[model samples]
Target: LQSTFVFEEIGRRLKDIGPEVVKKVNAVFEWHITKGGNIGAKWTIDLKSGSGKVYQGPAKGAADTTIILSDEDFMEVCLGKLDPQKAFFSGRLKARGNIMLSQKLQMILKDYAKL
Candidate 1:
């Protein structure tokens, strides 16, 4: 888990058990490369990879929903320092694509809160 970056930690944790659940639920994700504001990094959380996969690259797949947030807010949220509801409401967290897929992240938020 990357201590300084929530995405890295989240990616690691998700990859830990995401495959099993994703196989059953069929959820998928692909993060975008940033738009001069996103801090410039792209990674893939392709749930349809049969066992699911987390990798670095440019748009390798699509998702039921896509998430975007600044490095700072992401770190804060993962550190349990920021309220996710508030973060999303305040624009610190951004969601695109299917939108409904963001609901799948509730478990992740709870996990981070416990951390």
Candidate 2:
């Protein structure tokens, strides 16, 4: 990712839905690594409260889930050019922490990718 891309991508998702709509979607907390990135970014989703935001550095506290991969992999996932499971198995996408919480993304990821 371009560093800022994390913020831009998640920010756009947050902006897509209205305040109330986001909160209803459910919550998620994720950290990302851009392959070579020394200091990546973390983002949170408060679907129950309609809040979402991104940070420059990693999560200060632990997040519900984590995602580590390269910018290319990210683009691949988002573009529907790659399968998440395939990415994971291929060692391109790595997700850790709360597996249950991460499922909330099923509804939103493709939406993000298509745009």
Candidate 3:
């Protein structure tokens, strides 16, 4: 997913749910546009293990379970915002390799949704 999609989704989810829940599903990435000079960013997340890692590189040498989203969307998730479900349904986000990773993400995020 790109940052635009990620940011927009995060903004939407944050507006819908709240900050606390968003924070729980923590994420990480770089801010090339905001910081300037840098070209791109990457976001890494591991839901099952309840752990996560962020860096400017490929995020290699980490656990087997991992999801790589565009730097743009990565920012949104890390900012404690963005709804994974909405992003997926709307096609604003993209997931590769382990597609189930996205579902796992939903389960983690749904915990915060309003009843």
Candidate 4:
């Protein structure tokens, strides 16, 4: 599936699970998807806001973290096919800002597989 579609699903699923994550993460995440349909698109996951929200576009303000990676790698990562840590070390993924908080992303990705 395409990255846009995946983002859509993330938005939908987040409505149910986001509040739980928000309390813990309390941050914003911007994802830059490259090398596929909807390339250069930015998806924002705002867990720091009210009840949390996932939308396609820039963050409301500054993103706590920005993650850049190929659309293919993102798809694989979401589907539990690729390890984010490995991708980060292997250069398939690039994360800027609050690097330590970035690891918390695994919490979201972990739930995506059940969706």
lDDT of each: 0.62, 0.61, 0.46, 0.82
For residues 1-115, write the lDDT of model 4, one tens digit per residue: 3788988877887787777778878899999898754457888988886678888888979999999998889989877799989999999899999976878767665765457
Could you give candidate 3's per-residue lDDT for residues 1-115 as a string of tens digits? 2564554454455554544543554433222322242445443332222233333444344433334444555466556576655665666455555556456456656565435
TM-score of model 2 (CA atoms): 0.68
TM-score of each: 0.69, 0.68, 0.38, 0.86
> Per-residue alpha-carbon lDDT of model 2 for 1-115, expressed as tens digits?
4545655766776666536445545554565656565434445444444455555555555666777777666677666688877887888777888764555565555455456
Error of 4 at 23 (Å): 0.4
The candidate that achieves the highest lDDT relative to the unseen native structure:
4
Off by over 4 Å in 2: 16-21, 37-48, 109-115
Show pairs that collide, candidate 1: none
User: Clashes per prediction?
Assistant: 0, 3, 7, 0
| Top candidate, metric TM-score | 4
Write down the RMSD of all candidates, one decimal each: 3.8, 3.3, 8.6, 2.6
Question: Candidate 2 vs candidate 3: which has greater lDDT?
Answer: 2
Ranking by TM-score: 4, 1, 2, 3
